[PDB]
Amino acid sequence: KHLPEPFRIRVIEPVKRTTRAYREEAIIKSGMNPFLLDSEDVFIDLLTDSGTGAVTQSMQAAMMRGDEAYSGSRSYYALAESVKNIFGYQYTIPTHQGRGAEQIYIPVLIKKREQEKGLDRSKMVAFSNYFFDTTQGHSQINGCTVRNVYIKEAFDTGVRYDFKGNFDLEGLERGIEEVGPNNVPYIVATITSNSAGGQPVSLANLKAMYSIAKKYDIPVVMDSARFAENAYFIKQREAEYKDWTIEQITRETYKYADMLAMSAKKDAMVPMGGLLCMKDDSFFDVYTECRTLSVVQEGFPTYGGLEGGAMERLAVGLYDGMNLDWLAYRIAQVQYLVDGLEEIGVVCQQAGGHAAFVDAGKLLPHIPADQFPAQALACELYKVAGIRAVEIGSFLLGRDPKTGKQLPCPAELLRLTIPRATYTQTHMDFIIEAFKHVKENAANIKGLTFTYEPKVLRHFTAKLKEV
Amino acid sequence: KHLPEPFRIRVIEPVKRTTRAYREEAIIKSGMNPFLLDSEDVFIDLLTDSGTGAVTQSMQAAMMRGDEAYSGSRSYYALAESVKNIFGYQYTIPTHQGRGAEQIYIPVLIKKREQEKGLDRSKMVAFSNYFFDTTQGHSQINGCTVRNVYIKEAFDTGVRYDFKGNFDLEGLERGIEEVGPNNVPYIVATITSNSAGGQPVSLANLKAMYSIAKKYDIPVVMDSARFAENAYFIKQREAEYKDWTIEQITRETYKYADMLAMSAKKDAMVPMGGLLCMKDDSFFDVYTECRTLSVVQEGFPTYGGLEGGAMERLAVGLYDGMNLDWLAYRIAQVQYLVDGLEEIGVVCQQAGGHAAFVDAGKLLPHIPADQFPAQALACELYKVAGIRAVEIGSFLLGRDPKTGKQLPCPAELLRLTIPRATYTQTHMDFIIEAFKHVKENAANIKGLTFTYEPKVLRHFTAKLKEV
Amino acid sequence: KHLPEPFRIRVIEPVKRTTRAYREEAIIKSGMNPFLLDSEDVFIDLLTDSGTGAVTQSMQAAMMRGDEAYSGSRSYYALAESVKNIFGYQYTIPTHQGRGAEQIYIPVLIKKREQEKGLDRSKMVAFSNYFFDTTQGHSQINGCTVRNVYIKEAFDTGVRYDFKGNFDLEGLERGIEEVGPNNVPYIVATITSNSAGGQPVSLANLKAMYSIAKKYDIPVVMDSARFAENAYFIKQREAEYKDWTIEQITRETYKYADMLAMSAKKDAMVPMGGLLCMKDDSFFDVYTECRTLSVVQEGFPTYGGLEGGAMERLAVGLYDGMNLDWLAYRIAQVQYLVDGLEEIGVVCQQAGGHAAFVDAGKLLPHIPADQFPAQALACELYKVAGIRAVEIGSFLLGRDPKTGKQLPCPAELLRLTIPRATYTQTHMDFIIEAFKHVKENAANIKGLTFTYEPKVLRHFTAKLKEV
Amino acid sequence: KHLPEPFRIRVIEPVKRTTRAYREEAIIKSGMNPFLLDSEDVFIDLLTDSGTGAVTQSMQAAMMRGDEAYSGSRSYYALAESVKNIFGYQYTIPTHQGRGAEQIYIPVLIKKREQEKGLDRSKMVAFSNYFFDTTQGHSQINGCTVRNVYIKEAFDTGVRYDFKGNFDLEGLERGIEEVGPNNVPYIVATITSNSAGGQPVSLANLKAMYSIAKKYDIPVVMDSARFAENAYFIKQREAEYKDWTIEQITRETYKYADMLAMSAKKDAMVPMGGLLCMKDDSFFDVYTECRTLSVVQEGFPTYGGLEGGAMERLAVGLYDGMNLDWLAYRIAQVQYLVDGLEEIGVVCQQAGGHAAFVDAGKLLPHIPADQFPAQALACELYKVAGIRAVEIGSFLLGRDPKTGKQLPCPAELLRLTIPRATYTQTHMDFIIEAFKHVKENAANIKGLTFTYEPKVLRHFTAKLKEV
Ligand SMILES: [Cl-]
Ligand SMILES: [Cl-]
Ligand SMILES: [Mg+2]
Ligand SMILES: [Mg+2]
Ligand SMILES: [Mg+2]
Ligand SMILES: [Mg+2]
């Protein structure tokens, strides 16, 4: 059941209703690539939920109370205070480049263990219940190998488990043992986990994981773009915390990490910004090095920073993001969409709190992988309902930078994400109806072939035509 | 069918979900009177749609571009320009007291015909397809009798007519004839009409009415709080204008009035403000007298006025209010609620575009009129779903100021109104489910009796208890 | 000395610099009447300080936190709470029509004493240290005569007194005695006083006045558009309160009135809104009648009200308006202008905290009163420096509504007011330089004569030409 | 002469007036380091003018009209359109990391000439009238040496020249010749130039420089954080453009560069954001590579971006920043401060449109360089007037990372910058009065010595005590 909105809509952004003929022309003009469509021509934009959600009245109002001082800003103080009261962390470093908090702490933590515990860079290995691509990216660079230690039930769509994002405790213990504690720069706890479309991590599991890290004195970083939704799943599924508030669950949760790194563009409800925070003095030197490195990150003095209003807004957003009614509503809507698609016969490879990955291959079996069936599905959804979704398949994968040949892809998926507090149950039903229509007319949808193809990052600007 | 929102939600006002026990206590604390409930304790507030709707991004942004000059304000110019371009009217007088545009033009038009056509105040009669209580109020005072000349189908809920708000053309011609053209100070065309919960007036009808007024040289005032919705019904139901835009229909519509008076708190999408405008020079002297009278309205110089930002916002709102997709969506939602209630057996005395008037008497037949069955229904709806609705029955009617006895009331109704772009289809279903529940438990709902009763306007602050 | 701004400028409204030739054309186009000039063509607009001042960041931000509920609004609660904490008054009635709080309490207080103390309407007399024209206006209507009981030093520009706004205590006692306590509906304490351009009232004086009113059980209304500036003058000049904060002085000050009526467009720093508040239960019935009368003010149900954001903004503005550094700065700037003009030989009939009234008659002795020397001075100031000021002389006075002849005027003054936190010391010097220039070229300035003259309120739209 | 503000102040940020005793305690608490002071305790913050200036009403309003779409955003379109209309550049890449536009184009341009003209990385040399430290920073890294080719009059404070920021034309021609055209990756034209506190570059000079670059087919990058002020100096001092508007001068100016890189936190009037733009198709491949590299800048997909409102605001700011009256006023204020300090005997090593560098060494001759006389001066200015300025001397310079010994510094300067449209002439006089006071009490000011010193970037968090 889709829950009623625990709020009154106060400000809206008008979106025009287009005709099928108009959309048919638009998609062609865009070279059969939704990435090239004007935002105005997209009725329901499911491209991403990162920074595309709505804000509350107080969050919006905060933007007008900014202190733009280079240092000692009361707006920076308000943000730090929110972090202290919510996560119990004493040190706060605002980030603006976005999820840009990892490019900072990774090199710092590596050097730390290397100078204190003779870490061997050529043998360094970092662990996580599931590294976010970017996190894994900044880690591999610097010469650090990553390893995901997720549980067996994680990707098993056939079995229902309450916390599929959980760390594989024995796996982690075994990994550190194998690699050697001196060569483990850090452990990243992602909540909720990005595995299988977004799955929660239990507090019991986090405690166990932290005890392991603590035993081997290994820094733990909480990747928390969705800290609030994880706290909600814990309240909903972990018996021990049934009567705890989201805030209490969050405070308890962060006792099991030494620092946190997060994009504020998800649960924190803001269009931009991020955080890199440290719990206490035990990590003051890591805080210093990070703050310092943040300035000379380029090898010399460079200056940037969120405007005062943005820090004031995030200071409020961290709290509004934890509203219990809001979280129940947000998650119920996502689940409502998934259940609705399942009912009409739409098959998903994986579906979680983050996104739903529809199997375009199975929906459009007649289209060869090289003809991008998921990109064809994206264009059809737009033609039919003006919906914009992103292909996560051969089109995105690209070609081998050494052979110029198409890279092999395991599945042709179409990703659906949901901007927070942006669309209603009616839009959800509209999406479901759209898929019902596509499934009914599947046999007629055509494959695609390039007319223009960039050498790199082709999914963003390539143009194609129907086969 | 409830249409999907032709917009993205951008700003929300959080509303807490309460427990039944909490609401039971709240309603008692409020003395069984929703008017006494804190806004925060109301989940779905259907008290009124006047100034309680959402605004668009551009409308909100306009508030920060105000020119606060006492005179020659560019913000006043922008508002006047919008009126000129939308209605084709050259003179604009912003009003702030709200629907406070009538207290001005009424006395002015009376004096006008009295000095030019020897109007006899003791025999003056004003006509309208249906006077809004307030309009009728300011008219009666000053010594002017009013007469509603609506068509036979207007209040016939058994027959479906496309324009139930239409003027009774023959009735109007007959009325002027009877009263004498010299004694008719003005004719008010209300669009959409407030009769039968809100019914549209056709352009054909307005033309016919204006021709009649024009023949007898009688000023026509367009009461247009819902000018956009009327324009939408014309586009939807009057064949001749099927392919016309809302803007074109509006421009054509206003050729059939000499001036307009309107609260901007409805279709214009703003929380405050109103307008009093004149079409052309033919009514320049009426404009002068109104503007002048607006200053010395109290018999001497008094100063007030909308802030610059408010005029800039209304200048944008007049346009956003005419968005075709928005209007289709707004009206479809209202109709969705009505149809849903009808399906579950809820009976309404009248239901239109403005509001739905549920017959509490029939829903709660065991409760005597003097025990306020519609006030009891309002309290039950709040207890069950946290909905706030207004009683329009014996409770509201009050007592005879000369006998102190309860005044007789024809029906015990509970009014439901819908704030624009505020609630979703899910809230609509929640309301319907609520009524389904009340209808199922109707026999147990108790009547009410005073514990505290003001001498006047008792519905606002009276307290009652269950019988 | 002009004090430095106790604030950082955060948002500005661009104003174009015009050429003399451009202004010469503009003033002619405007018919030698600044009231007809576009705001954009005025470089420094000294027309009025009512609602034309700047707001603080928090005040502006508050506009986006509004609760638009018809009743039980948390925004109304915040405003009431501010009044309770600042003035110690338990009952708050927001007004929007502006200074529209008097049209309500006057009739209510008259009827009160008439039913409780057999007040005789034909002999009713209200007193005040100095009634604001509007206040005096609403009072005279209803059949109530007013009497200003100001001290001898009040208008004596030759003598410097710390509190020229003080009540003439013996005069008041004598007046009540003469008129009879039963015929005194109320006493209005205006702070600061509008006499002599704005003069403060001491707390000692208010206490004494209240004791007198209390002895005769006569309601006291505090007209407080400038409550904060009066509190500042008390802190600055009344020895006993030298170390008291503005807030403490304000709380003490309001113990000496039974209710307050105020336009929020002055010291409260907002562009619109007003208040009508009652101290405690002793005046609950007056509160009820006022609230009630506010709804049926027209003899029947009429609905209006400030938007939620406006109440939230005023709730903050009441506090920001009391900032000590702000008040010192605001008042010092006004005094800086006055002192500067005096230095260059410009003579003022009266000059206080509210405004400066330059004697145009003495500055332009060659121009006959009937040729409006103060209107000629206003046009010259605009031509020379793009400044807009209002004439307070024969032009404004108008003609006798019974003889059509010009009414005699005691002096031809040009009023200068200063919008709060809007202009700088540089603009002040620019104004002074402008007057220096006019004084130097006084002999060449020409008188004016009508080319277009309205029958009423001619100063707003009349056009004139040079003689 | 300080010009009057060509605007009305509309929103203010309150700043408390502190006592000397309070400041004495604050500076000690801050360890004699203004960088450690709370913004709230600083009356006049001259730390930096980067992102600390005010915005116009329209710029602020734009923040509420954002389109947060990941791609095809109408807000991105508005920003691109502004760039096209103002600079005539067809390609726009918004940057958020701040002046972070250089870390992108530098590597791209190097690789370009290296693959097309066999550029030799070991011999690459980039030229500029004067590289901004950061620009020079990103350039040196990547293996590129930089060379400033400024004119002889540039740093000659004894001679007055209209365009001290001019390129040394012969020097540039000679440099390219020497280094070899194939080894010159690009030429950066900084306007206004950062040399000597900020000096303008003439259009004649830019044309000449571009012709040289064009002859050798070398890409020209216009570093334009202060494009508007440079355009103003050209209008003021370059005879040929005396009657040209700022917009016309800007359009002409950009014909002499192939692309532009700029921080929007200066002349563009916004608190955050930057731009990297390309003129036409001739540089489409450079645009692609930059855009592409902007995504995989970390060696893999990373996502960030300015929120829609921020792009809408910058789209307006680019225009408001060019207002002629504003620019004249802004520059006159800066010059007013410089002239005022010179009058009282304060000596500056260099003073321009960007900042004034007071020679603390000469002002406080008794304090040894190692005791940081400029840091002592900063603390004294704060104690005396609550002003915060930044030391640019031995304190900032730091120690040799190889000897741990203090690095030698040519002069001990105290930098003064002025946030745009933030402070008034009164604050300027307050600053001047402050220096007058310090100069009078110079002999008593004490030197400083560390109590806490970070290993790197010590100026930001080091604590010191008086000697
Ligand atoms: Cl706020
Ligand atoms: Cl806008
Ligand atoms: Mg900043
Ligand atoms: Mg106003
Ligand atoms: Mg309202
Ligand atoms: Mg974004």
Residue numbers in the entry:
A (entry chain A), B (entry chain A), C (entry chain A), D (entry chain A): 5 to 471
What does the literature reporting this entry say, word for word?
E. coli tryptophanase (tryptophan indole-lyase, Trpase, EC 4.1.99.1) is a pyridoxal 5'-phosphate (PLP)-dependent enzyme that catalyses α,β-elimination and β-replacement reactions of L-tryptophan. Trpase consists of four identical subunits (~52 kD per monomer), each of which covalently binds one molecule of PLP. The tetramer possesses a D2 symmetry, therefore it is a dimer of dimers with two different dimeric interfaces: a catalytic interface and a non-catalytic interface. Using kinetic spectrophotometric methods and size-exclusion chromatography we have previously shown that the inactivation process is linked to the cleavage of the PLP-Lys270 aldimine bond and to the dissociation of the tetrameric form of Trpase into dimers.
The two apo mutants of E. coli Trpases as well as the wt Trpase are found in an open conformation, different than that of the closed one found for P. vulgaris in its holo form. Residue 330 of E. coli Trpase is located at the non-catalytic interface while residue 298 is located at the catalytic interface, yet both mutants showed a similar loss of activity. Both W330F and C298S exhibit similar (90%) total cold inactivation, but the time profile revealed a factor of about 8 fold faster kinetics for C298S. This may be attributed to the relative proximity of residue 298 to the PLP and substrate binding sites as well as to its location on the catalytic interface, in contrast to that of the 330 site. This suggests that the loop composed of residues 295-310 is highly flexible and may be involved in the transition between the closed and open conformation. The flexibility of this region may account for the faster kinetics found for C298S mutant. The location of the point mutation, i.e. on the catalytic (C298S) vs. the non-catalytic (W330F) axis, affects primarily the kinetics of cold lability.
